Design a protein around this ligand. Structure first.
Ligand SMILES: Nc1ncnc2c1ncn2[C@@H]1O[C@H](CNCCC#Cc2nc3c(N)ncnc3n2[C@@H]2O[C@H](CO)[C@@H](O)[C@H]2O)[C@@H](O)[C@H]1O
Ligand SMILES: Nc1ncnc2c1ncn2[C@@H]1O[C@H](CNCCC#Cc2nc3c(N)ncnc3n2[C@@H]2O[C@H](CO)[C@@H](O)[C@H]2O)[C@@H](O)[C@H]1O
Ligand SMILES: Nc1ncnc2c1ncn2[C@@H]1O[C@H](CNCCC#Cc2nc3c(N)ncnc3n2[C@@H]2O[C@H](CO)[C@@H](O)[C@H]2O)[C@@H](O)[C@H]1O
Ligand SMILES: Nc1ncnc2c1ncn2[C@@H]1O[C@H](CNCCC#Cc2nc3c(N)ncnc3n2[C@@H]2O[C@H](CO)[C@@H](O)[C@H]2O)[C@@H](O)[C@H]1O
Lengths: 257, 257, 257, 257
């Protein structure tokens, strides 16, 4: 079928990409980086993220495969030829992970996150009111906030004390970054896990400029009126050719491998 | 309909229970603590837990209401007469929360938890292997482990650094109690959120005696071979007469009220 | 004696400053903001920090007093006239708190911190090697690091999970900011408390530009070769007119007041 | 000089102890387990703790050496003969670490801790008032409290989120065990580091029976009126024959070795 391969850019990944394309030339596989049905990422998780955002507008028409040269990449380089044959056969199972939708309104722009989306200030102190489903939950003071996807809970979310979360759970998790808690300032302190259809809105208090990140992209937004977080209706689809449970790759990435 | 009322036992709750029974006598309400269709709890969360476990074998035939004299109790004492009329009218919406199933096998006994279930040792050091869906995830060394329900995430789970979790998410959360992490001993460190159909099994390493708790009940189990945690097929049903969102009562219980 | 008063700049603090100067005019007190022996700060902790850094080169010749209009400010506005008389009498006890010395070398500039000093990157990822007394302790990957004074442990340090620390202990505390811990990346995770004469050196790995903060001042340093942290030989002296223990003001600021 | 050797009891440590005694027989070394001037511990940290408590009443007359068969034990088994010669020469430097004093009053018994001392309840809920230097600081509700020595900060204290602490700092650290924090219950949350001459007193609220631990010893105390924690006037003396900094053995025990 139609496919393309992205590369980390280093010498090891470029030649591995060339060898796979040559192997695909022995099958009925058409290279097409405009409308690929399979997107193969050769590199680290950052390479996989760049591949996801490159084709973030054809998610319901693409299955992703990562090659580790790696949390999202679940294929070793020595298994590259076996992946070529299995991918050429065309018999695989489709696994879908939830995504996070971020909406920024001024006085709007929407983004899509596979890992997480964070909010910080433009230099000054970070103060926002957290509104959950039109209900004011807290006034947050600290460094920032992090809204994570299920697969992203093992990333930035994990470093902030968040809980690890199985991707079969369509939900999002919010965690704090060095929150201020005293006699007057008070936040929940604990990570919050929100289901679908729940909308978390961050509203400015004084400063209206925020440094907002979506995965590896970070932009300084000015004159912000609202940042809306909610579980996206879009999902990322993975092409899986063998059993690799989520808790097993969590074990291999943090326990031992 | 059929109903019963349990009381904290103090003077304030006993007379409040008597006044509600007298008010129910003015309607077509039959008191029956054997097969009640409505179980009213008058007291704290501990009183509500005792009421839940008293009728834990007729959950699919009971709706619970708590009166705060209180996380589960969402009614003030001054609103008691209004609750009598609304309950007498019989028009309310049913809200269901997930529960936790605990299975203990020797060389079996099953329990049901509304808050959480924890495992500790019988005095010696606590060492168990954590097996997730027949896959060995880690070997835990520390004080103990806590498997929490969604509504219980704000209880013992919250004190252990766990994430707060909306009850619409049918799942369970596991957290650590003073885990040992060094060059040789290593655990995930982070809370784990497990969906339905996922089974978490704790298996002994040396000592086989464990102090196991289910909500307020704590028993010393001897010659233990396996402790199995999984989201229960049973659910607790609440009788709700007005909108009281989960994040609002989280706000009222921890932020301000 | 010689003295000066700094103000938060708002209407409440400016007129309070004018009333105290008029009260000092009834005594043998000479106003001198060039060589003051007493520096009175009227405002919040930020106002107190600005006053400290304004006279950070005459610390061994100045005693500080804060008026809360407030962790460092231990005087209420209604007690202003009583403070004028006691300060005019000249009989008070001197209390000294340790300070933090920060040295930045390029390819040097030194700073003095009353609260803490933090290091972040200039946009890219933050990776430094932590060298304790010429011994490589760890390679840190995350958001940043925070080296705090004893009195600053209740500030930014507290939000990062650090321990609260009595100012009689001449030492400094280092805490992590969202550290990365997996199979390959590994840090100590725990706050580190260093005594006097211990030198903690942060050395760059790839990027050499860092956003370094000292209390409220934050500057982007370029071509950095080493950031050295150590307990300063300089100490800040407070003028205390009544018993106000450190744990009592910790209680009043976080427990209840 | 006078000396004795304790053993872990296993086959590896017993024969190693026999070989060292035979090597000591070639020098002017008298074995005496009643009044030894050098106490050699062969085993783990638990073996070292048992050796410390065995001679806890002659600390100012004993230097300790640990052999790892190990945080306190800073000698490898293959270096045993070199230790025999150096110990026989008698030229070594003395390193002293602070200790923790625990006093329990009823309606008194004192203990000495090298690692830490913890308080839990006898089954019921744990509620105590924390009084720092005759000043009520907080009312603690949770699982328990842990008062640690500087060298013990890397032990139980580290698992509870406490800060690591250099032993040159004569002080003690208190940490919480699953503290309850809501709208009504509120604790400091953060670890507390207390200098010398500071007394921390835990006073009962309802239940007066507590399970108190001192290192590996744990006893159920009944009718308790006060538990007093303070830095002990006694210190443990180590016999050091080579440079092994505290942060280096922290690195070797948690980072890599
Ligand atoms: N202070 C901090 N602590 C921790 N992470 C921080 C962080 N600040 C930022 N981030 C992460 O940086 C990413 C920016 N692009 C980096 C590419 C990536 C990635 C990634 N995804 C996952 C995942 N889904 N599950 C588990 N591990 C994952 N990783 C690994 O995290 C490490 C990051 O280099 C590498 O090992 C990665 O393989 C962002 O999306 C934030 O998630
Ligand atoms: N060390 C610790 N820290 C924190 N909790 C611990 C704890 N050790 C034990 N437990 C809890 O004790 C319960 C034993 N019966 C107590 C009755 C109860 C309850 C309860 N349920 C919830 C809930 N679902 N959401 C939010 N708050 C809740 N509460 C409040 O928690 C406080 C407990 O007294 C009271 O305010 C309760 O109202 C157990 O089930 C453990 O959950
Ligand atoms: N993410 C975060 N979380 C927590 N603190 C952060 C933070 N980021 C930055 N900072 C602090 O900001 C200060 C920058 N100038 C603010 C003026 C100040 C102050 C101050 N000193 C102390 C103290 N010594 N003990 C206890 N409370 C203190 N406070 C209070 O902390 C609150 C800060 O507004 C106010 O209540 C202050 O009264 C810096 O020095 C960082 O210490
Ligand atoms: N839940 C928990 N988490 C963590 N520690 C807990 C714990 N509950 C209890 N304890 C510790 O158990 C000790 C009871 N006797 C065990 C013998 C011992 C020891 C010891 N001392 C230190 C030290 N000074 N610095 C760094 N590591 C140390 N170790 C290591 O800690 C591990 C304990 O087996 C072993 O690796 C030991 O080598 C007690 O004193 C509590 O300190």
């Amino acid at each position: 079928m139609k496919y393309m391969i992205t590369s980390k850019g280093d010498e090891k990944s470029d030649l591995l990409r060339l060898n796979m394309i040559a192997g695909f030339g022995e099958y009925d596989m058409e290279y097409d980086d405009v409308e690929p049905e399979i997107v193969i990422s050769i590199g680290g998780d950052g390479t996989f993220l760049s591949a996801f955002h490159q084709y973030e507008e054809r998610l319901d028409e693409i299955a992703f495969i990562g090659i580790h040269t790696g949390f999202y990449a679940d294929w070793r380089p020595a298994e590259a030829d076996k992946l070529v044959k299995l991918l050429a056969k065309g018999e695989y199972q489709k696994v879908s992970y939830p995504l996070l939708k971020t909406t920024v309104k001024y006085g709007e722009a929407t983004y899509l996150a596979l890992n997480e989306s964070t909010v910080k200030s433009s230099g000054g102190p970070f103060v926002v009111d957290v509104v959950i489903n039109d209900i004011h939950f807290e006034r947050f003071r600290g460094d920032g906030l992090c809204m994570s996807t299920p697969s992203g809970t093992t990333a930035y979310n994990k470093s902030l004390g968040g809980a690890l979360m199985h991707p079969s759970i369509e939900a999002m998790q919010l965690t704090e970054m060095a929150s201020i808690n005293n006699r007057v300032y008070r936040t929940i302190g604990s990570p919050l896990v929100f289901p679908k259809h729940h909308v978390v809105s961050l509203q400015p208090v004084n400063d209206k400029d925020f440094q907002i990140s979506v995965d590896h992209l970070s932009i300084l937004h000015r004159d912000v009126q609202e940042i809306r977080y909610e579980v996206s209706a879009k999902k990322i689809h993975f092409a899986r050719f063998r059993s690799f449970p989520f808790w097993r790759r969590v074990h291999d990435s943090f326990i031992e491998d």
